[PDB]
Symmetry: C2
């Protein structure tokens, strides 16, 4: 079994998510926002203009919300970027959490970060690990609300296989 200690990690290249499969989400908006848009999957496409947004139209789901991605590949995760909705939007996400897994069974958390609905990308210095699965979670305990929206999720690191 492992432990958590310090590393020298280089700032890593983006891992370009052609392929990549959202394979479980708590909530998405299959209508309100576009139709083509709002889905969990809008999060790991190429498209900026397309964002994931929690269900709000005709119902909403209680927090917490999360999204598990298969990156189809073992990878040394170094950073995690979130392009927020920004553009003067009501996106009152105060806190986000990341975890990762090699199996999609035993999860290990790689940090809890503040969120800011800025237009630029949020660079998040996660605890690096070898992983194929990341789970973005919007926790039940942050001052987070049901309103939550994210244009893109990106993973900086190296490929290692």
């Amino acid at each position: 079994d492992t432990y958590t200690g310090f590393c020298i990690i280089k700032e890593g290249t983006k891992i370009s998510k052609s392929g990549w499969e959202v394979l479980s989400f708590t909530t998405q908006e299959a209508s309100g926002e576009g139709a083509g848009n709002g889905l969990a999957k809008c999060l790991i496409d190429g498209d900026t203009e397309t964002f994931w947004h929690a269900k709000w139209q005709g119902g909403s789901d209680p927090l917490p919300y999360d999204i598990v991605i298969d990156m189809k590949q073992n990878i040394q995760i170094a950073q995690v970027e979130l392009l927020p909705r920004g553009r003067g939007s009501n996106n009152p996400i105060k806190v986000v959490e990341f975890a990762a897994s090699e199996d999609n069974v035993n999860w290990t958390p790689i940090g809890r970060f503040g969120f800011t609905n800025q237009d630029a990308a949020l660079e998040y210095y996660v605890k690096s690990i070898k992983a194929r699965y990341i789970r973005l979670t919007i926790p039940d305990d942050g001052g987070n609300s049901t309103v939550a929206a994210i244009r893109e999720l990106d993973v900086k690191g190296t490929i290692i296989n």
Copy 2:
């Protein structure tokens, strides 16, 4: 350029230093202790019974003392073991420092640890890095003395090439 953050590192296997070349030391004892024994190189042989010991016989060198090893290989360093002289010896090393390098030019420190002249090996949870060169240093500033002796240095990690 890099930075220092947290990693999940597994407790690593020993890297078995057949090959490996001490390629610079501050001090060794080419006489007092055995003749065959006391040398910097006694530090990265197989042999327990053979230890490095700072020059003491007919002269001694002022602190600090260090020893640079080529491991002949890029390696993700996870831990560092020092078998001390122990066996009720006067080995009043209070502090040790490690650094590592890919080039043997730009060095990066991977920790400053307490030393204890116990008989068992000292496991040292260094800051992991990719490296071919480690430098063991006995610093000028520890309460360390000219008397310093070490049976073996070992490196736990993975090979990565």
